[PDB]
Scaffold this active site. Sequence first.
Site, mmCIF file in Angstrom:
data_model
loop_
_atom_site.group_PDB
_atom_site.id
_atom_site.type_symbol
_atom_site.label_atom_id
_atom_site.label_comp_id
_atom_site.label_asym_id
_atom_site.label_seq_id
_atom_site.Cartn_x
_atom_site.Cartn_y
_atom_site.Cartn_z
ATOM 1 N N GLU A 55 -11.697 4.930 -6.755
ATOM 2 C CA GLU A 55 -12.081 5.186 -8.136
ATOM 3 C C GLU A 55 -10.896 5.432 -9.047
ATOM 4 O O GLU A 55 -11.077 5.278 -10.252
ATOM 5 C CB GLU A 55 -13.025 6.412 -8.253
ATOM 6 N N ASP B 49 -3.568 3.830 2.171
ATOM 7 C CA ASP B 49 -3.892 3.555 3.568
ATOM 8 C C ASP B 49 -3.841 4.884 4.325
ATOM 9 O O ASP B 49 -2.735 5.373 4.595
ATOM 10 C CB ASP B 49 -2.874 2.522 4.094
ATOM 11 N N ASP C 43 1.187 4.378 2.469
ATOM 12 C CA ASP C 43 0.717 4.923 3.745
ATOM 13 C C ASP C 43 0.758 6.443 3.785
ATOM 14 O O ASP C 43 1.851 6.962 3.581
ATOM 15 C CB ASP C 43 1.557 4.346 4.903
ATOM 16 N N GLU D 186 -13.207 7.190 -1.437
ATOM 17 C CA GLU D 186 -13.935 7.077 -2.709
ATOM 18 C C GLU D 186 -13.035 7.458 -3.863
ATOM 19 O O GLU D 186 -12.833 6.683 -4.819
ATOM 20 C CB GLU D 186 -15.187 7.971 -2.700
ATOM 21 N N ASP E 152 0.841 -1.191 0.000
ATOM 22 C CA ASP E 152 0.000 0.000 0.000
ATOM 23 C C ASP E 152 0.889 1.260 0.000
ATOM 24 O O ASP E 152 2.118 1.148 0.047
ATOM 25 C CB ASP E 152 -0.954 0.061 1.212
#
Length: 100
Positions: A66, A74, A43, A62, A41
């Site tokens: 998207e 994260d 961070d 969101e 990820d």
Amino acid sequence: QLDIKSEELAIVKTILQQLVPDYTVWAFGSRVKGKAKKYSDLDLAIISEEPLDFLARDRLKEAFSESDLPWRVDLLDWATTSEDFREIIRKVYVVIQEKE
Ligand SMILES: [Zn+2]
Ligand SMILES: [Zn+2]
Ligand SMILES: [Zn+2]
Ligand SMILES: [Zn+2]
Ligand SMILES: [Zn+2]
């Protein structure tokens, strides 16, 4: 430094400026530490005083879900992050955006 792609940094950079431009944002974690794997990820510490307004939070998640980024972003809330953990983030981080 920040092990992400040029194009990925601008995507992140745009989303942060449109949804939380009154927030400073720091990247930390394996991508600032040279230890990034493909699906690691990203961070991001969202820096403020008081816990991020739920709504702007949602809208951030969101926008990142998207987007075209090939891994997960994260989000960490500095305001509800403990001192011990703040001290570890301060050892190594990259500033992404400062509050205007
Ligand atoms: Zn990570
Ligand atoms: Zn982590
Ligand atoms: Zn993480
Ligand atoms: Zn997290
Ligand atoms: Zn301290």
